[PDB]
Amino acid sequence: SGFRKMAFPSGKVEGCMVQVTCGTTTLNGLWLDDVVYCPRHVICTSEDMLNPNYEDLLIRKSNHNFLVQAGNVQLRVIGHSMQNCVLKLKVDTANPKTPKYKFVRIQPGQTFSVLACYNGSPSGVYQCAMRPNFTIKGSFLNGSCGSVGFNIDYDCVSFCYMHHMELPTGVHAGTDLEGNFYGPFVDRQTAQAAGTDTTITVNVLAWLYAAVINGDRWFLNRFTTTLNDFNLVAMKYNYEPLTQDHVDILGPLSAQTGIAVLDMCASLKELLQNGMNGRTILGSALLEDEFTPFDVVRQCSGVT
Amino acid sequence: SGFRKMAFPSGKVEGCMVQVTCGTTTLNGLWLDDVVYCPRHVICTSEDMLNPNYEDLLIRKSNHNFLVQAGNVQLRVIGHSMQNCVLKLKVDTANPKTPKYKFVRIQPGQTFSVLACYNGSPSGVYQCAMRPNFTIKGSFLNGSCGSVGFNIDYDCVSFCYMHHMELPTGVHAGTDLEGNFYGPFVDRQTAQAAGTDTTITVNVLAWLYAAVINGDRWFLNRFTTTLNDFNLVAMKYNYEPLTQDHVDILGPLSAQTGIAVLDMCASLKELLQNGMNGRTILGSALLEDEFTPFDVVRQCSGVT
Ligand SMILES: Cc1ccncc1CC(=O)Nc1cccc(Cl)c1
Ligand SMILES: Cc1ccncc1CC(=O)Nc1cccc(Cl)c1
């Protein structure tokens, strides 16, 4: 028992981190097979970051201008190209530690582990969620760019995120591994609006089932609700509207605990309307939305 | 910016995890050099767990009765011995992936990363703290025994914890890597009292400095306090008494923010006396005590 904001073991991703330098700028790179992926702003200087013309800037760069270092050994760059907001540096050596992997574009609400890096070296790993507004509430400093978000299914690493920037609001923005930004964000040092962030209702419900599994049952009530009635409450509290798709994915947790999805929604409704009253659920004084129903099942059953 | 419950990258510890079987019991083992460390209850059956006579049970076990498996390959056991509550299985092969390492016995209040394992395979990594009462609030299921807690200083892994049992209360108990339990706990399936748990005051103060560094400053007040006055409040709220030693370790954070340690104590005093009033600090609705002053400095400066 016990429930934690658990990240995936980062070993497979650690063996992929490299340092990429270009001019005065240094950031992290992702070495899979004979290719190094990194944010395209590695080619920019501080004057450029206001409104960089990446196509013009990259034209002044040759393969030799990109310094790729794995540990303390140098990688020979034999090719370079831009794909959306990432650079793919073709190197003459395949990464001997390249795990089985996929490039995946996640949906908002889904979660992933971030391996935060500086100068190609790992500093820490944490679990986070793609917010409904396509930002992440990470922990990143200057030089963290190029750090990646991932998921792991037995031996396959699905890379889903690459960190690019911190918005003036303190939240983080980045791309999938094809360099397409999540959300409306552009890689420019400019004021950018993130959407209104909503709470991931299906994840809060999954976390309430995780609380029941682990003994925290005070919030269970004698009530039930409908999807429509629940969503009237969710709308008011800026919670994502619950669909039959969300109810279906909560099916295994509902079966495990014997608590119907709509009865759990009724508990969530009372929690939203009356607060926690100074109490806690799984060591938290607020409703947690960063565990998907999949994360709950995985953690409570010990999937390796 | 941003602050997360970050764990150490687990790669160096992943390469050390093995599966250890003895009779019907299987748990995790830690392979460093030519030695495999695991909990001594691997030699027990369900009847034994009530009051096991480990010295008598181990006498019925030969090197061949201990099945050690790293990935899918078997390790030949050439020796076995008991040290307190751990078994040290001498194997004929040194772990090729053994990192630089130390065995350390942590103090309560200190933090560490846990790499939770099942059948020798890693399932996840999370950051946790040794509670003042010597228990950990982990996330562990049956088969997680043998999973280790560690810290990393550049390239050296300091192993500080080995998971042994879950108390009937749902909290977790274990040993250092010499097999000495933290706290009064014994490796028996019996009702055991954990101490009254207190909040780690120096860690809450470190986390309030982390909030200030990252923009959350609403809790800063026009007040100051004394160590004695503060401790009268800490006593009432079951917070650890603050000493000049704790004040000294908060020195770097005090210097970084320009907020005197005692002024921060006064903010904590008002927070304890008046609650959060529905507000949050670093995405939390309660006072977080699982980040040491060292963890705050490391995270806010990007130590790799
Ligand atoms: C300072 C920091 C903190 C966290 N994560 C990243 C950073 C650096 C950063 O924001 N870079 C940046 C800024 C605007 C545009 C672009 Cl392309 C990149
Ligand atoms: C079921 C579980 C959940 C979390 N962590 C561990 C476990 C197994 C467990 O508690 N083992 C145990 C019990 C009493 C004594 C001793 Cl020696 C070992």
Side-chain angles (χ1 to χ4, degrees):
Chain A
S1 54
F3 211 69
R4 278 286 181 178
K5 189 77 64 91
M6 202 173 292
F8 284 108
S10 58
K12 287 149 187 289
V13 177
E14 284 170 54
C16 307
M17 306 312 299
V18 301
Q19 174 193 82
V20 179
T21 302
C22 188
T24 75
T25 305
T26 294
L27 44 60
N28 308 281
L30 182 69
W31 186 19
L32 297 162
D33 297 323
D34 63 350
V35 182
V36 176
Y37 304 86
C38 74
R40 70 174 176 173
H41 70 257
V42 69
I43 68 173
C44 299
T45 79
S46 279
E47 280 164 354
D48 303 319
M49 287 316 311
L50 272 169
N51 179 58
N53 185 313
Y54 288 102
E55 282 180 343
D56 282 3
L57 297 172
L58 187 55
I59 282 171
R60 311 292 143 174
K61 304 299 182 178
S62 297
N63 301 323
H64 68 255
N65 293 133
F66 294 105
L67 303 176
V68 183
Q69 200 175 322
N72 239 48
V73 301
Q74 211 68 23
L75 286 180
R76 184 174 305 277
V77 180
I78 64 177
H80 73 264
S81 61
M82 183 158 72
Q83 178 180 21
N84 303 303
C85 303
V86 306
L87 293 189
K88 300 187 289 171
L89 306 176
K90 196 186 174 175
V91 291
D92 77 338
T93 302
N95 186 353
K97 307 190 199 83
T98 304
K100 287 190 184 179
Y101 77 97
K102 280 192 182 280
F103 285 172
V104 307
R105 189 178 172 96
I106 59 170
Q107 293 287 289
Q110 295 307 108
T111 59
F112 59 93
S113 295
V114 167
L115 178 65
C117 296
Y118 298 89
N119 298 114
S121 295
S123 54
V125 64
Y126 54 90
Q127 187 74 3
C128 81
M130 178 57 62
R131 300 309 314 163
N133 74 349
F134 297 102
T135 59
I136 86 172
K137 308 195 176 149
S139 175
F140 287 118
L141 303 172
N142 192 34
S144 71
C145 302
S147 300
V148 298
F150 60 94
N151 285 276
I152 308 164
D153 187 30
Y154 171 50
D155 67 343
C156 184
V157 176
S158 297
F159 290 102
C160 65
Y161 178 77
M162 183 170 283
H163 183 62
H164 285 240
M165 51 161 203
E166 181 181 66
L167 290 154
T169 61
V171 313
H172 306 105
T175 75
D176 57 24
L177 273 292
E178 294 184 338
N180 294 126
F181 264 90
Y182 282 89
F185 311 109
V186 287
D187 46 358
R188 280 184 66 195
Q189 191 182 311
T190 194
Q192 302 176 42
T196 301
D197 200 39
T198 51
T199 302
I200 315 148
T201 310
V202 66
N203 289 4
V204 171
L205 292 161
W207 166 87
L208 292 167
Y209 277 111
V212 168
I213 293 170
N214 291 278
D216 267 320
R217 326 158 54 96
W218 66 266
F219 57 88
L220 292 181
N221 61 28
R222 320 191 148 268
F223 323 138
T224 198
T225 189
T226 69
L227 262 191
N228 280 177
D229 174 63
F230 180 73
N231 292 340
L232 293 183
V233 181
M235 161 82 190
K236 176 194 186 70
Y237 289 96
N238 273 88
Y239 262 64
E240 270 269 347
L242 201 76
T243 62
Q244 188 52 56
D245 269 19
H246 293 140
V247 172
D248 291 345
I249 312 166
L250 294 163
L253 291 181
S254 175
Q256 196 166 326
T257 70
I259 297 163
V261 171
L262 294 172
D263 292 2
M264 195 59 100
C265 297
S267 284
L268 177 55
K269 173 172 159 207
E270 297 299 305
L271 278 177
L272 284 171
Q273 290 173 342
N274 303 328
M276 326 250 310
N277 278 116
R279 305 185 285 270
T280 61
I281 297 169
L282 289 175
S284 179
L286 50 86
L287 300 151
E288 299 274 320
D289 78 344
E290 298 204 317
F291 298 99
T292 70
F294 308 81
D295 297 347
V296 173
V297 168
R298 194 194 289 110
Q299 190 172 158
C300 301
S301 68
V303 165
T304 62
Chain B
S1 54
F3 211 69
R4 278 286 181 178
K5 189 77 64 91
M6 202 173 292
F8 284 108
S10 58
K12 287 149 187 289
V13 177
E14 284 170 54
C16 307
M17 306 312 299
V18 301
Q19 174 193 82
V20 179
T21 302
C22 188
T24 75
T25 305
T26 294
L27 44 60
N28 308 281
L30 182 69
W31 186 19
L32 297 162
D33 297 323
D34 63 350
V35 182
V36 176
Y37 304 86
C38 74
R40 70 174 176 173
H41 70 257
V42 69
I43 68 173
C44 299
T45 79
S46 279
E47 280 164 354
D48 302 319
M49 287 316 311
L50 272 169
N51 179 58
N53 185 313
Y54 288 102
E55 282 180 343
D56 282 3
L57 297 172
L58 187 55
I59 282 171
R60 311 292 143 174
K61 304 299 182 178
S62 297
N63 301 323
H64 68 255
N65 293 133
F66 294 105
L67 303 176
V68 183
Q69 200 175 322
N72 239 48
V73 301
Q74 211 68 23
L75 286 180
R76 184 174 305 277
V77 180
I78 64 177
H80 73 264
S81 61
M82 183 158 72
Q83 178 180 21
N84 303 303
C85 303
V86 306
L87 293 189
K88 300 187 289 171
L89 306 176
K90 196 186 174 175
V91 291
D92 77 338
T93 302
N95 186 353
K97 307 190 199 83
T98 304
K100 287 190 184 179
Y101 77 97
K102 280 192 182 280
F103 285 172
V104 307
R105 189 178 172 96
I106 59 170
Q107 293 287 289
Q110 295 307 108
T111 59
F112 59 93
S113 295
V114 167
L115 178 65
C117 296
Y118 298 89
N119 298 114
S121 295
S123 54
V125 64
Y126 54 90
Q127 187 74 3
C128 81
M130 178 57 62
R131 300 309 314 163
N133 74 349
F134 297 102
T135 59
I136 86 172
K137 308 195 176 149
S139 175
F140 287 118
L141 303 172
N142 192 34
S144 71
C145 302
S147 300
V148 298
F150 60 94
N151 285 276
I152 308 164
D153 187 30
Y154 171 50
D155 67 343
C156 184
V157 176
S158 297
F159 290 102
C160 65
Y161 178 77
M162 183 170 283
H163 183 62
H164 285 240
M165 51 161 203
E166 181 181 66
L167 290 154
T169 61
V171 313
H172 306 105
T175 75
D176 57 24
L177 273 292
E178 294 184 338
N180 294 126
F181 264 90
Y182 282 89
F185 311 109
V186 287
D187 46 358
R188 280 184 66 195
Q189 191 182 311
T190 194
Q192 302 176 42
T196 301
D197 200 39
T198 51
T199 302
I200 315 148
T201 310
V202 66
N203 289 4
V204 171
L205 292 161
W207 166 87
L208 292 167
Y209 277 111
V212 168
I213 293 170
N214 291 278
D216 267 320
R217 326 158 54 96
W218 66 266
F219 57 88
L220 292 181
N221 61 28
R222 320 191 148 268
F223 323 138
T224 198
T225 189
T226 69
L227 262 191
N228 280 177
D229 174 63
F230 180 73
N231 292 340
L232 293 183
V233 181
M235 161 82 190
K236 176 194 186 70
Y237 289 96
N238 273 88
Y239 262 64
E240 270 269 347
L242 201 76
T243 62
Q244 188 52 56
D245 269 19
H246 293 140
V247 172
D248 291 345
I249 312 166
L250 294 163
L253 291 181
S254 175
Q256 196 166 326
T257 70
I259 297 163
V261 171
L262 294 172
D263 292 2
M264 195 59 100
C265 297
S267 284
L268 177 55
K269 173 172 159 207
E270 297 299 305
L271 278 177
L272 284 171
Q273 290 173 342
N274 303 328
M276 326 250 310
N277 278 116
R279 305 185 285 270
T280 61
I281 297 169
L282 289 175
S284 179
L286 50 86
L287 300 151
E288 299 274 320
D289 78 344
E290 298 204 317
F291 298 99
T292 70
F294 308 81
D295 297 347
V296 173
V297 168
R298 194 194 289 110
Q299 190 172 158
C300 301
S301 68
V303 165
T304 62

